[PDB]
Amino acid sequence: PRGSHRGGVFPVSGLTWGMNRPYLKRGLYQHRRDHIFTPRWGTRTANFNP
Amino acid sequence: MQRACEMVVSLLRVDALSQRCPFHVLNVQILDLLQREGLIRGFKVDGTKIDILLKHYKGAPVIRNIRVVSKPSRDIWLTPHELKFRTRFNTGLWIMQTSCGVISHRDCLRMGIGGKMLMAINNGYQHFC
Amino acid sequence: XXXXXXXXXXXXXXXXXXXXXXXXXXXXXXXXXXXXXXXXXXXXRHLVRLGXXXXXXXXXXXXXXXXXXXXX
Amino acid sequence: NGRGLFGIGIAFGPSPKEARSNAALAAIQNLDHIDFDVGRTLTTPVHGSEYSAHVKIVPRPLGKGLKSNLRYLPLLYLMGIDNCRVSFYGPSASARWFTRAKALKRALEQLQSRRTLANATGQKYDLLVAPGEHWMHWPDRWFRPISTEYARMLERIKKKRPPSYRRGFRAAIDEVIPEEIRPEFTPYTWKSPLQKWAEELKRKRLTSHNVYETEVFLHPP
Amino acid sequence: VDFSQNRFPVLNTAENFRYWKDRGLDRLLPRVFPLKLPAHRRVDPLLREYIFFLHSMDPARFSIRKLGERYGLKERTVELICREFSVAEFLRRTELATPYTRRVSREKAVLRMKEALFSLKLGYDQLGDEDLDEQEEHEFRGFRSTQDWIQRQNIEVEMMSAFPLPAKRNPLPKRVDVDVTVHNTSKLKVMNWIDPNDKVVF
Amino acid sequence: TQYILNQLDPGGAGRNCSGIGRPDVRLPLAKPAAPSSPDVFDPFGTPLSERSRIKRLYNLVCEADSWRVKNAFPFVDEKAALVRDLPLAEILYCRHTH
Amino acid sequence: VRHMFLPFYSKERGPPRIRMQVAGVKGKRFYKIVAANQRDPRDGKHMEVLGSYAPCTPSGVEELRLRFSRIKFWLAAGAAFNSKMGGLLGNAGLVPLPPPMFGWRTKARYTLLESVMQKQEKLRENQLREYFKTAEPVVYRQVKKEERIRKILR
Amino acid sequence: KLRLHQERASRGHIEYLRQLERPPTPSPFPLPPSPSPSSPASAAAAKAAAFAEQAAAQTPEPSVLVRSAEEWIKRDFFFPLSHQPDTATAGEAARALERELGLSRPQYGGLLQQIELPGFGEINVVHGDLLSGSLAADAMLVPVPPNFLPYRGFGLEVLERGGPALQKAAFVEVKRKLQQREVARDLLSGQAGREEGEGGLDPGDLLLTPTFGVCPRVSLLAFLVTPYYWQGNSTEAARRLRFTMRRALDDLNRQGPGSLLLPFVGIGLYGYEPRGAAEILVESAVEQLLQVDAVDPNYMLRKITFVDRDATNAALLAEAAQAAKRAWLPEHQVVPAPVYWSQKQRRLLDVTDGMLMFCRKHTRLSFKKHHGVIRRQKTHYFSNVRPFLWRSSRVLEPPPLLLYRHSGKPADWQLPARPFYRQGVSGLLFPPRLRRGFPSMRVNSKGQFVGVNKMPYIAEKAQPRL
Amino acid sequence: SVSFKNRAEWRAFMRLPPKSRVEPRRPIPRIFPWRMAHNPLPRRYPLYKHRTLFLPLSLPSYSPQPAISGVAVAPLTITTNAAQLPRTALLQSAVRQLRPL
Amino acid sequence: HFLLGPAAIEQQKAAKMQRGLTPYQTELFMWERQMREIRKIYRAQYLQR
């Protein structure tokens, strides 16, 4: 395929779009990985160390 | 061939213990194949008619569908490697007529012989012509 | 005597006196009609008897333990 | 329920929300059982028709899962089908789902199972990843326990048969009770020094009392 | 405990085929599964260095097969260990790059992170846990493993009888062309194109 | 007995089994008996070797962990759903292949 | 011509020959070794595909694929070929080695060059053994100041 | 022995044919029942079909060129397809070529392989019978279970042939070993108490006894305690055998015998894999003959002969010995040709700091910057794929050529061919009949092969795709 | 010794010797018989999960296979991978290469 | 073996010259003489197979 998507563009996460929805407009939003399951198999640190 | 396409109707009856169909040697052979495959309880030959005693299971009949392939106005033949593709991934019975008799598509596939596709029993939704 | 009764995969029974004859017949069968597998309860207990005779000192303890386990 | 119970309900209401609630109630009342196979594969492709509405269900190889329009993938998960692709060609008349529902119901009514086919026919319908799953039955005459006196009587009455090593070997088992073992760290002469060292360390770690101790912090307070 | 019409208590059943695999609405639960890591990255680096030393010293007495046999690894794993260690040692001793300046792919960087966290959690293995020659075990290994591709069928429909049935037609191996090198020098490579169907061979 | 044992844990020449049915392997019987009348036995010590685990069952047991899953203010909800709801996001969140 | 191979001979086009058709795309060119008639178009009509020849390949070594039995068959049938094909077949071993451009007798300077090159190769092998006796991956050598030198052995 | 490129190409062709050949396996066809479970016409058709299918299974088929298209079509629709198509086998031409090359040109083969370590000894691999075949040796090694009461196999056969005398001698030796072990255990317990102030033989245990007229080729029988294969993993099952062979050979060498006859240890009763066991056996023999471990060598064992009665097992042992030659003997060491030539031209370079300026980049990681999604599929196929397809068959890169390390000439043993199958399917139920068995030829009305002029069909080999 | 202070010097060093514009100069690209035209690659999260090559073995023969020496040889599963061949399959492949023909 | 070994090149080198021919041609003609032989050898083997 080539060119922009011609037709209906839906988020790949499956979340609806609207005024009070996770997405304001139509789109794929493939970079938004917070809307897909990414297990945390590592560690975590804090902004400050008292 | 006409008699077999007619017997399809008698085989597809529901809420019936037995049903009659026209007589023919081809019908008798197809009935033999069906009984060997355990799709009918039995059948009886009475002159111009054959009385098929049908089989049921949990209310519904064992024969859930019949798809006619070879009609008297059009033959359908297949090579072994076309029969394999056409019967791919299906538990239904495709009746084949060959120089070795009226057999199942599985017998035809093991024998690698060219055959004429007559009927498909309980083949779901799988046809090409 | 020696009887090679063949219920399935013909087998034979040896008495430690016909072992030579059994071996000869097995070799002859393997040479003439291959793949006719023949198995005989030849010399398991035959070796066991001589082992017990050699280990008579500890064979008594072994037999006592076996009897105790069987009774249990 | 995603396992073989599915239904569709059509209902009216003063508002869309109450209409949906009544429709859900009707669907709950209309639930029926779908004839699936425990192997999770279709035995044949399936088609359903209602006027100009057409529903098609095509098998897929075991492992691919469900394929359909994302608009109706949740419907597939509710139906509980697996390893198949579902396509709607639908009516072009005034209605869209009123008759498509009947078409889908008639399609689902076509599905059968290997157990159903085998019971109806008397023949073998064996899934290659599970042969003999449905027809193989070990007779109860194999597992008939006997008392000691009757065992003596049976040993007396019966005629002995020589034990065949090929078919008789590996038969020294009896009633078993649970016992914990750990033969992964049992020292042997043939085990190399490094293997012994690693196995010893592993067994100490596994049997240690500090296991099951979940500490989120690497450097504890 | 549910019902079964026939007695066959084994693990080779459609119910137990993919045991523990979701079969209902739980298929939508976001479960976390263990991450897979290479054996050549699971074994301890000191064991890697020891294997590399043995192989680079005496590849005959310390064969790949023998090293794998002693340390519970596969021949491919031993080969990978030796290659990686030789590359790292070459870079370090020639002072070309440190272990943290060799440009690598994103996948290999993620693999390095995976092994780092694996060691921090469980610690490097002190011995290999693989098998030298894998066994014929009935396991699900993808959708391709669940069907007979040659027969193009997932279900073997057959009749019930107490007597022998006609044998199934066996497949014949495909006769495909191959290239076999016959003469290679620093300038020219000559290989014979073979057609296995050609009857007259000379 | 051997047939059932082989079905439960395949083994034989060239195979790695648990040796459970072997006459020379120890089992945790409830009623102890002769390992395997008095005439035939093992005159030497020859302790029975241990039995190794069943690999399939052990793997199932180990992998079960991945599938393990971890008055009131009387206010009644009237704008509630009887059968919940199954949006597309619930599927596409975790089932990546879709 | 023996009766068997008569069809291989064309009244309109000529006798059979073993030759090469251009193949590939502009820039990336290799050759398909075929048996055709003399007056056939080079990239057109032919009778059989006998192999391929790629002088430029990523591996840096000219690649020659041939059906050995078929080349033997066509030589027996009588297909003709030119100097380049004869040389390729000689290198492949299918036919005796054709003489070089000016003949074997005329090559003495080149034999002297080959001998000198072999002697220099042996000298470098001896130097490499002397290096192996120490095998220092990194060295420092003077310009003013000492610079680092890496002794890579490719 | 082959020194011609043509001969070696024929050798490779023969090897690939070996790969692809499958011998016929006729099977009985069930007799049709003669009570009729169907109509009489169906029964007659069944009888005819059964006989026809048996004939089709048991008869082969010639090539296409023998018959015409209409005859083949009529046969295809009238008879069951034969199980042995012409394309199935290799051919009399290939068989004759193999015979001429010597690859495949009165019961036992004899000496199949021999490794000669000058100054150290010899390891022979022989197809022969140890017992009935009993050109000389000192000790014959016999594997036995730890309990020393075999129920079937070579050990039981040897004990039976020896009779009560050999059985008693072996049992006496076992009793002595057990008593020594018990004494050592008691001493160990006493010494443990002093510092504070199992059972049965193990793998590698050796017992030497007189032959009692069992094997006249030897004068000593060394019973060796060997492991089993079932325990644990295959790595463990083979570590056991390696340890056992090391101990057994070392102990026999210390005992003194200079000649040893060894069967295939591990196979048979103990359920080992012959292919994996042969490598261990041969490598252990080589290492012991070389005395790799010893700091004070004890060169006593100098002839080790692996004797086997099965052709397959003897051939596997010969293959293991060939691999051992490749590994150990510098003459037989082989190397890929690219590596050989590169190292032959090997040179020492002087790389400075300024020569690596552009060998390093700004980015820490590398990834593909463009997806591989083709915008126009047919245009891509026509422009960038089809022009380079000079044949429609799918062939992989050839395995590298192995050259002898010392000389550089091609090795007599080369890697097997690497065929490709689409989606991994390597079989066809109904392979099409091909004319390319005799390419560019036909059969004239006289009955003779003649040439054919015809433009080749570029897609002939991709129909069906393989 | 040569110092490549800029990219021009690096290009000069790396440049191949001049060749005529009538001969084949660019190598013909490799074509793998399983991805002739597309080169799939992953384009969807997770981007770096482990992918294992599986080539089906199915059932090369459907008739009773006698044991080779002592190993069963007869198939027991349909899930065998042809890129991870088991012990007995490798044994069969080795015996075939040793058959006398 | 003779034709494809190192003897053919030596025979070419030893071929005698005739007045009017360059050194290459006299080797080419001997070289072609060996070619007519190998062509006949291939025909015999192919025909027997």
DSSP track, chain J:
-TTTSSHHHHHHHHPPP-TT--HHHHHHHHHHHHHHHHHHHHHHHHHH-
- Give Cα E124 distance to the centre of its chain: 21
Q: How many CB atoms sit inside 10 A of residue F52's CB?
A: 22
- E10 in F contact zone (CB under 8 Å): yes
Technique used by the depositors: cryo-EM
Q: Is H428 in Cβ contact with E172 (below 8 Å)? A: yes
DSSP for I28-44, please give it. PPP--TTSSS------S
- Pairwise CA distance, residues F58 & F54, whole Å: 6
Q: Is I101 in Cβ contact with H21 (below 8 Å)? A: yes
Give the three-state DSSP class for F85: coil
Cis peptide before G55 (omega within 30 of 0): no
G93 contacts: CB under 8 Å, gap ≥ 6: E182, E183, E190, H4, H5, H6, J4
Residue D160 per-residue DSSP state? P
- Cβ atoms H300, H258 nearer than 8 A: yes
Residue with tokens 């002739």: I36
Task: Establish whether chain A is in contact with chain B, requiring a minimum of 3 CB pairs below 8 angstroms.
Answer: no
Q: Is F39 in Cβ contact with C45 (below 8 Å)? A: yes
Angle between helices E45-57 and E75-94 (to 10 degrees): 90
Q: Which residues pair with H307 in a beta bridge?
A: H126
User: Tokens standing for F5?
Assistant: 């044992």
Residue I67 per-residue DSSP state? -
Q: Minimal Cα–Cα distance from B47 to chain E, Å?
A: 32
Q: Which residues pair with H336 in a beta bridge?
A: H402
Task: Establish whether chain E is in contact with chain H, requiring a minimum of 3 CB pairs below 8 angstroms.
Answer: yes
Q: How many CB atoms sit inside 10 A of residue G76's CB?
A: 22
- Pairwise CA distance, residues D15 & D22, whole Å: 11
Q: How many CB atoms sit inside 10 A of residue I64's CB?
A: 9
Task: Name the helix (H) or strand (E) containing G48.
Answer: strand G48-54
Residue with tokens 């010494």: H191
- Pairwise CA distance, residues G75 & J35, whole Å: 9
Residue with tokens 């050598």: G141
Of C23, C43, C54, the CB nearest to H168: C54
Q: Is H347 in Cβ contact with G151 (below 8 Å)? A: no
Mutate to test the interface with G, among I26, I30, I31, I32 (most CBs of G within 10 A): I26
User: Tokens standing for G31?
Assistant: 């050759």
Give the three-state DSSP class for D1: coil
Phi then psi for H404, rounded to 5 degrees? -60, 135
Residue G7 per-residue DSSP state? G
- Pairwise CA distance, residues B128 & C18, whole Å: 72
Q: Minimal Cα–Cα distance from E118 to chain I, Å?
A: 16
Nearest to D181, CA basis, from H347, F53, H231, H163: F53
Q: How many CB atoms sit inside 10 A of residue D120's CB?
A: 22
- Cβ atoms B18, B54 nearer than 8 A: yes
Please provide the distance, in angstroms rounded to a whole number, between the alpha carbons at the two ends of chain A.
Answer: 54
- The identity of residue E137, as a single letter, is E
- Pairwise CA distance, residues D74 & D88, whole Å: 14
- Pairwise CA distance, residues H285 & H306, whole Å: 10
- The identity of residue F65, as a single letter, is D
- Pairwise CA distance, residues G38 & H209, whole Å: 83
Give the pairing of strands G29-37 and G16-24: antiparallel
User: Tokens standing for H307?
Assistant: 């004797």
Q: What is the CA radius of gyration of chain H?
A: 32
- Give Cα H128 distance to the centre of its chain: 20
User: Tokens standing for H182?
Assistant: 């018990």
- All chains having 3 or more CB pairs closer than 8 angstroms to chain B: D, E, H
Q: How many CB atoms sit inside 10 A of residue E61's CB?
A: 16
Residues of chain I neighbouring F10 (CB-CB closer than 8 A)? 76
- Pairwise CA distance, residues F21 & F27, whole Å: 9
- Pairwise CA distance, residues E53 & D8, whole Å: 70
- I29 in G contact zone (CB under 8 Å): yes
Residue with tokens 């196995």: D199
- Pairwise CA distance, residues H143 & D213, whole Å: 50
User: Tokens standing for H350?
Assistant: 């002087």
Phi then psi for H170, rounded to 5 degrees? -65, -40
Q: Is F34 in Cβ contact with C54 (below 8 Å)? A: no
- Cβ atoms H420, H399 nearer than 8 A: no
Q: How many residues does chain B have?
A: 129
Q: What is the 3-state secondary structure (H, E, C) of chain E?
A: CCCCCCCCCCCCCCCCCCCCCCCCHHHHCCCCCCCCCCHHHHECHHHHHHHHHHHHHCCCCCCHHHHHHHHCCCHHHHHHHHHHHHHHHHHHHHCCCCCCCCCEEHHHHHHHHHHHHHHHHCCCECCCCCCCCCCCCCCCCCHHHHCECCCCECEEEECCCCCCCCCCCCCEECCCCEEEEEEECCCEEEEEEECCCCCCCC
Q: Is C47 in Cβ contact with H159 (below 8 Å)? A: yes
Give the three-state DSSP class for I14: helix
- The identity of residue D88, as a single letter, is F
Q: Is H175 in Cβ contact with C55 (below 8 Å)? A: yes
Q: How many CB atoms sit inside 10 A of residue G1's CB?
A: 11
User: Tokens standing for A8?
Assistant: 């209906």
G12 contacts: CB under 8 Å, gap ≥ 6: G39
Residue with tokens 């998960």: D77
Q: How many CB atoms sit inside 10 A of residue E182's CB?
A: 28
Give the three-state DSSP class for B101: strand
Tell me the Ramachandran region of residue D13: left when phi exceeds 0, alpha when psi lies from -120 to 50, beta otherwise: beta
Q: What is the 3-state secondary structure (H, E, C) of D65-78?
A: CEECCCCCHHHHHH
- Pairwise CA distance, residues H402 & E177, whole Å: 21
- D161 in C contact zone (CB under 8 Å): yes
- Pairwise CA distance, residues E197 & H86, whole Å: 9
Q: Which of residues 34-93 of I touch H (CB under 8 A)?
A: 34, 36-41, 43, 54-58, 60-61, 63, 68-71, 82, 87, 90-91
Of D74, D77, D172, the CB nearest to F21: D172
Task: Name the helix (H) or strand (E) containing D126.
Answer: strand D124-127
Angle between helices H311-328 and I87-98 (to 10 degrees): 90
Alpha helix (H) residue ranges in chain D: 16-30, 73-79, 97-110, 114-121, 148-157, 165-168, 193-207
Task: Name the helix (H) or strand (E) containing G132.
Answer: helix G109-132
- Cβ atoms B99, H79 nearer than 8 A: yes
- Pairwise CA distance, residues G19 & G34, whole Å: 6
Q: Is H391 in Cβ contact with E184 (below 8 Å)? A: no
- Pairwise CA distance, residues A34 & A18, whole Å: 18
Residues of chain F neighbouring H232 (CB-CB closer than 8 A)? 16, 52
Diameter over CA atoms, chain G: 85
- The identity of residue B47, as a single letter, is G
Residue D184 per-residue DSSP state? G
- Cβ atoms J7, J21 nearer than 8 A: no
Q: What is the CA radius of gyration of chain A?
A: 16
- Pairwise CA distance, residues E66 & E72, whole Å: 10
- Give Cα G147 distance to the centre of its chain: 43
Residues of chain F neighbouring H174 (CB-CB closer than 8 A)? 44
Give the three-state DSSP class for D185: helix
Report the half-sphere exposure of G116 (CA within 13 A, side-chain side).
6
Q: What is the 3-state secondary structure (H, E, C) of chain H?
A: CCCCHHHHHHHHHHHHHHHHCCCCCCCCCCCCCCCCCCCHHHHHHHHHHHHHHHHHHHCECCCHHHCCHHHHHHHHHHCCCCCECCCCCCCHHHHHHHHHHCCCCCCCCEEEEEEEECCCEEEEEEECCCCCCCCCCCEEEEEECCCCCCCCCHHHHHHHHHCHHHHHHHHHHHHHHHHHHHHHHHHHHHHHHHHHCCCCCCCCCEEEECCCCCCCCCCEEEEEECCCCCCCCHHHHHHHHHHHHHHHHHHHHHHCCCEEEECCCCCCCCCCCHHHHHHHHHHHHHHHHHCCCCCCCCCCCCEEEEEECCHHHHHHHHHHHHHHHHHHCHHHCEEEHHHHHHHHCCCEEEECHHHHCCCCCCCCEECCCCCCCCCCHHHHHHHHHHHHCCCCCCCCCCCCCEEECCCCCECCCCCCCCCCCHHHCCEECCCCCCCCCCCCEEECCCCCEEECCCCCCCCHHHCCCC
User: Tokens standing for H445?
Assistant: 């009305």
Cis peptide before E166 (omega within 30 of 0): no
- Pairwise CA distance, residues F66 & F59, whole Å: 12
- Pairwise CA distance, residues E51 & E79, whole Å: 10
Residues of chain H neighbouring G10 (CB-CB closer than 8 A)? 453
H9 contacts: CB under 8 Å, gap ≥ 6: E180, E182, E192, G68
User: Tokens standing for I87?
Assistant: 């012990």
- Pairwise CA distance, residues H224 & H140, whole Å: 10
Q: Is H97 in Cβ contact with J1 (below 8 Å)? A: no
Q: Which residues pair with B52 in a beta bridge?
A: B19, B43
- Pairwise CA distance, residues E79 & H366, whole Å: 25
- D136 in F contact zone (CB under 8 Å): no
What are the angstrom distances between the C-alpha of D117 and each of B40, D122, H120? 13, 8, 72
Give the pairing of strands G29-37 and E172-173: unpaired
Q: Is G154 in Cβ contact with H439 (below 8 Å)? A: no
Task: Establish whether chain D is in contact with chain C, requiring a minimum of 3 CB pairs below 8 angstroms.
Answer: yes
- Pairwise CA distance, residues E127 & H235, whole Å: 12
Please provide the distance, in angstroms rounded to a whole number, between the alpha carbons at the two ends of chain G.
Answer: 56
Q: How many residues does chain C have?
A: 72
Nearest to H308, CA basis, from H138, H203, H154: H154
Residues of chain J neighbouring E200 (CB-CB closer than 8 A)? 46, 49
- Pairwise CA distance, residues H357 & E157, whole Å: 69
- Pairwise CA distance, residues B53 & B46, whole Å: 13
B4 contacts: CB under 8 Å, gap ≥ 6: B24, B26, B27, B30, B118, B119
Q: Minimal Cα–Cα distance from I46 to chain A, Å?
A: 8
- Cβ atoms I48, E107 nearer than 8 A: yes
- F15 in I contact zone (CB under 8 Å): yes
Residues of chain E neighbouring A39 (CB-CB closer than 8 A)? 32
- The identity of residue H303, as a single letter, is K
Resolution (A): 2.5
- Pairwise CA distance, residues B98 & E185, whole Å: 60
What are the angstrom distances between the C-alpha of H425 and each of D129, E170, E171, I92? 18, 14, 11, 18
- Pairwise CA distance, residues B96 & B114, whole Å: 9
Phi then psi for B5, rounded to 5 degrees? -60, -25
Give the pairing of strands E104-105 and H365-366: parallel
- The identity of residue D85, as a single letter, is R
- Pairwise CA distance, residues C63 & F43, whole Å: 8
Residue with tokens 């599927």: F91
Contacts C–D by Cβ distance under 8 A: 13
Q: How many residues does chain G have?
A: 154
Phi then psi for B8, rounded to 5 degrees? -55, -45
- Cβ atoms F52, F19 nearer than 8 A: yes
Q: Is H287 in Cβ contact with E201 (below 8 Å)? A: no
Dihedral angle of Cα H2, H4, H9, H13, to the nearest 10 degrees: -40
Residues of chain G neighbouring E187 (CB-CB closer than 8 A)? 61-62
I59 contacts: CB under 8 Å, gap ≥ 6: E148, E150, E151, I75, I78
The contacts found for H288-292 with CB under 8 angstroms, 24 or more apart, are H288/H246, H288/H249, H288/H250, H288/H253, H289/H117, H289/H120, H289/H121, H289/H123, H290/H117, H290/H120, H291/H120, H292/E61
Give the pairing of strands D124-127 and E155-158: antiparallel
Q: Which of residues 2-61 of C touch H (CB under 8 A)?
A: 19, 23, 27, 39, 42-44, 47-48, 50-51, 53-55
Residues of chain E neighbouring I89 (CB-CB closer than 8 A)? 136
- H430 in B contact zone (CB under 8 Å): yes
Mutate to test the interface with F, among C43, C69, C71 (most CBs of F within 10 A): C69
I76 contacts: CB under 8 Å, gap ≥ 6: E136, E138, F10
- Cβ atoms H325, G123 nearer than 8 A: no
- Pairwise CA distance, residues E164 & E160, whole Å: 10
Residues of chain D neighbouring A10 (CB-CB closer than 8 A)? 70
Sign of CA dihedral E141, E142, E145, E150: negative
